[PDB]
Structure 1
Amino acid sequence: KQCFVTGRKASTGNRRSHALNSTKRRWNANLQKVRILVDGKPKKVWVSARALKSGKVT
């Protein structure tokens, strides 16, 4: 699950409680399934919502 255009992906870090108790966590990208024009043929692929902010034509 990566973004098709940018390369944006998930990453790992910690969830911290008020007492600073660490528990492993994940940060997923805002990936949406959209039909874009890869090399001529239309195709549905994962793109991050930020890569769609300006420049990608569904």
Structure 2
Amino acid sequence: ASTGNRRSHALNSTKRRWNANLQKVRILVDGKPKKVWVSARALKSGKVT
């Protein structure tokens, strides 16, 4: 999803995204070591380089 609202002090609403913290790093996909996007939360303890 990643969609919601930005709110003013008078509670006026405007549509807005929430983007993830993608970082480009070299990981070892099945095969060769590929350079790919991945999230910091993901590579916290989800994957090795």
Using the size of structure 2 for normalisation, the TM-score is 0.87
For residue 51 of structure 1, give the secondary structure of its aligned residue in structure 2.
Answer: helix
Q: Which has the higher helix share?
A: 2
Structure-2 separation of matches of 1:55 and 1:27: 21
Q: Percent identity?
A: 100
- The CA deviation at 1:55 is 3.4
How many residues are matched? 49
* More contact order relative to length (CA 8 Å, sep ≥ 6): 1
- The CA deviation at 1:54 is 1.1
Deviations 1:6-57 (A, max 9, x none): xxxx611100001100011110011100110110211011111001111321
Superposition CA RMSD, Å: 1.3
Using the size of structure 1 for normalisation, the TM-score is 0.76
Gaps of 5+ in 1: 1-9
